[PDB]
């Protein structure tokens, strides 16, 4: 992970 | 709660440059970097904004810094606008956050175009406001968000933002 979103 | 937390629910988050669905390069909590289709241009803009060689990745603090500036910038847009400022001034603090939210989304010019709804809000006509706001293109294109914002306008409460749960779709 480490990135965010939300997709 | 408040505007900051509110927009965090409605905007989402990236620590790395992302090409969003409208064809824009984006980062942080809905921070636009460039309309240009060049990733390198996105990076140049980002690097200039942060003051370092990011390679397209930023820290939470940096995201929060861009966020705080973007929120201030939405307030300035409100106060500079002849249609928005009076309304903003008349509103309580909960409903003010709803208005900052909209501006943060679609810009002062876009929000200033909601002529009748703005009038109803000035006149404290909360239900008519809600019904009128729901008639918009805005409401059709981003309904989940617009419903929460509209509800906040209707009630002057944080109820639409209380007791929401995440469902993955990132991490
Ligand atoms: C990220 O989403 C996960 C999956 O839904 C959650 O379990 C987790 O709690 C979420 N975490 C965070 O909120 C990380 C902190 C990010 C805070 C950055 C805020 C500032 C304003 C940029
Ligand atoms: C993130 O994704 C989840 C699940 O698809 C959804 O509940 C949430 O509204 C999304 N958040 C944003 C800001 O789009
Ligand atoms: C979640 O998935 C999307 C699509 O694969 C990526 O663009 C994003 O970086 C994340 O990995
Ligand atoms: Cl400005």
- Indicate the proportion of strand residues of chain A: 25-35%
Largest sheet data of chain A: none
Instruction: Give a list of the ligands.
Output: a molecule of 2 linked components (GCS-T55), 2-acetamido-2-deoxy-beta-D-glucopyranose, alpha-D-mannopyranose, chloride ion
Rg of chain B over CA atoms, rounded to whole Å, is: 17 Å
How many distinct beta strands of chain B? 3
Pfam family, one (chain B): Phage_lysozyme
Active site (chain B): 11, 20
Family (chain B): Belongs to the glycosyl hydrolase 24 family.
Main location (chain B): host cell
Features:
heterodimer; A: 7 residues; mainly beta; 0% helix; elongated; B: 171 residues; mainly alpha; Lysozyme; three-stranded antiparallel β-sheet; 9 helices; globular; binds a molecule of 2 linked components (GCS-T55); binds 2-acetamido-2-deoxy-beta-D-glucopyranose; binds alpha-D-mannopyranose; binds chloride ion; EC 3.2.1.17 (chain B); host cell lysis by virus (chain B); Glyco_hydro_24 (chain B); Endolysin_T4_type (chain B)
Short description:
Chain A is an all-beta fold. Chain A has one strand at 4-5.
Structure description:
The complex is a heterodimer of chains A (7) and B (171). Chain A has one strand at residues 4-5. With 7 residues, chain A is an all-beta fold. Chain B is mainly α and 171 residues long. Chain B has one domain (1-166): Orthogonal Bundle (Lysozyme), CATH 1.10.530. In chain B, 60% of the residues lie in helices and 9% in strands. Chain B has nine helices and three strands. Chain B has helices at 3-11, 39-50, 60-80, 84-90, 93-112, 115-122, 126-133, 137-141, 143-155; strands at residues 13-19, 25-28, 31-34. In chain B, strands 1-2-3 form a three-stranded antiparallel sheet. In chain B, a hairpin with a 5-residue loop joins strand 1 and strand 2. The longest helix of chain B is centred in the middle third of the chain and has 21 residues, at 60-80. Chain B is globular and about 50 Å long. The interface between A and B is small, with 7 and 10 residues. Chloride ion is lined by residues 73, 76 of chain B.
